[PDB]
Chain A
Amino acid sequence: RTIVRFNRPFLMIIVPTDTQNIFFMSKVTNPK
């Protein structure tokens, strides 16, 4: 029932699964 659609600007944070850290960070305002 709940839909999640990335058709507008977003953030993508790559992290460790069981650890609080940031390996990679990113904002996509335009995928092209």
Chain B
Amino acid sequence: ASANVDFAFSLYKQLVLKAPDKNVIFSPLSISTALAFLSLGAHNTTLTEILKGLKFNLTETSEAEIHQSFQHLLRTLNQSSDELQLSMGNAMFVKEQLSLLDRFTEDAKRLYGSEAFATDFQDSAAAKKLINDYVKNGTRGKITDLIKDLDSQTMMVLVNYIFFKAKWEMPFDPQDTHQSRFYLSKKKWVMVPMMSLHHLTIPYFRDEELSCTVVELKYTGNASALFILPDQDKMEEVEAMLLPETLKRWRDSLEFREIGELYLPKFSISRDYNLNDILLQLGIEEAFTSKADLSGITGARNLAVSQVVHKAVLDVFEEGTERSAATAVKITLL
């Protein structure tokens, strides 16, 4: 858990360097679960790079343990449908007539809830629709096309998806939504539906240190949305200090208070990503090269990671929030 948080922020820094001016949106959990799933059939350097990559201290934790921690969280899909929807999913679309260790097969199905689907990668019109139709079903239609182009020498594709819909404890009234200004820069702006709430008592903290303001808006289930609003020209000062300690200082400093007015855009955004470079910058190299030991899958050192892709979607409206994310690890011959 303290690992997933370190991993989320590491990843945050990386994505921003690549495009410092674009929206960022991702699910750390989806990326982690998919890298851990991959770790089943990985050996030696390959195997140790992914776990230290995911931020785990291998002196401390065993890997049989880490697998149980992922198995434990996934079990909490038990989900109470009391104004809260959740569903995670893992899959492995293996090439028709490729043989896997009984041991691989059993571990995926038992620890990650995975399912094995025989897919014919020579027919890429279809193998393509199959994986896209799988992801679309699970995200209930938000992520319509995770897989774009896909080669015929693709041996196997690992897939993870996460769906979450929730209600605000304090919903917004659509009647108080009016087009207003959203400033991209000090001198440039656009017009966006700006929702509002009045005389509301919620968790608050003004961090003079980082020149930003933090507020918590709760959802009925047991999750919360944390909003940080840096002063104009301080977004970079904040991002520079986005670390586990800082997230803890804010949460511990939050105090109840009555806000006269709160304005929040009603919006809907998504990002698409090729994670090869980012994982490489976090130290996961060998899984991509000729040296890849993924022999826990077949029993032979004949498979390598072609690519890792993620797509995430965030909807903010007056009744609640919807977000989904998907990660796919493309696997080829070595």
Q: Which residue on chain A has the smallest CB distance to residue B229?
A: A10
A19, chain B: closest CB distance, angstroms: 7
- Contact assessment for A24 and B227 in the assembled complex, using a CB-CB cutoff below 8 Å: no
Question: Is B44 interfacial (CB 8 A cutoff)?
Answer: no
Interface residues on A, range: 20 to 34
Which residues of B have CB within 8 Å of A18? 222
B279 at interface by CB-CB < 8 Å:
no
Does the CB pair A20–B2 fall under 8 Å? yes
* Residues of chain B within 8 A of A14, CB atoms compared: 223-226, 321, 323
Inter-chain contacts of A11 with B (CB < 8 A): 226-230, 238
Q: Is B232's beta carbon under 8 Å from chain A?
A: yes
A1 to B200, CA, bound (A): 11
Pair A32/B190 contact, Cβ less than 8 Å: yes
Q: Which residues of B contact A (CB under 8 A)?
A: 1-2, 4-5, 8-9, 12, 16, 21-29, 164, 180-184, 189-190, 192, 194, 204, 213, 215, 218, 222-230, 232, 235, 238, 247-248, 251, 257, 259-265, 267, 269, 312, 314, 316, 321, 323, 325
**In the complex, number of A-B residue pairs with CB atoms less than 8 Å apart:** 147
Within A1-32, the residues touching B (CB, 8 Å) are: 1-32
Q: Is the CB of A32 within 8 A of B257?
A: no
* From A7, A27, A30, contact of B194 by CB (8 A): A7
